[PDB]
């Protein structure tokens, strides 16, 4: 029954500049009132909680580091990554990011 198309693992860059597993979940996009924009939303698989709510900032350089990884700087000293079970799901979210930023989804980094 578990959806795999949008199933992801969320990572944050830790104090040793390695990656912390913050849990598996499912990723969607939606407009978030207080962030004034389309945002990436992850619900945790462990308990359904809101794990991630990240505005798609027009100026952020998102990187498609592999066919199933999207990586970006959320703030200073704060780096995030979404790892996708399905390349098709990664492509779906990459398209939304590229649409928000006015970029062609063929790029692998959205800002120069």
């Amino acid at each position: 029954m578990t959806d795999t198309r949008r199933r992801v693992k969320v990572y944050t860059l830790n104090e040793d500049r390695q990656w912390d597993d913050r849990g598996t979940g499912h990723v969607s996009s939606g407009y978030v009132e207080r962030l004034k924009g389309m945002s990436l939303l992850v619900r945790a698989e462990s308990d359904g909680s809101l794990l991630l709510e990240s505005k798609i900032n027009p100026n952020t350089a998102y990187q498609k580091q592999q066919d199933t990884l999207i990586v970006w700087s959320e703030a200073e000293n704060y780096d995030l990554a979404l790892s996708f079970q399905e390349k098709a799901g990664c492509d779906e979210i990459w398209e939304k990011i590229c649409q928000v930023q006015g970029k062609d989804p063929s790029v692998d980094i959205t800002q120069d």
Partner: peptide, 17 residues
């Protein structure tokens, strides 16, 4: 079968930013 499901990003170097 796949070995694992979830890739992880590379650990970033200190230099260059």
């Amino acid at each position: 079968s796949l070995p694992f499901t979830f890739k992880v990003p590379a650990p970033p170097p200190s230099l260059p930013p």
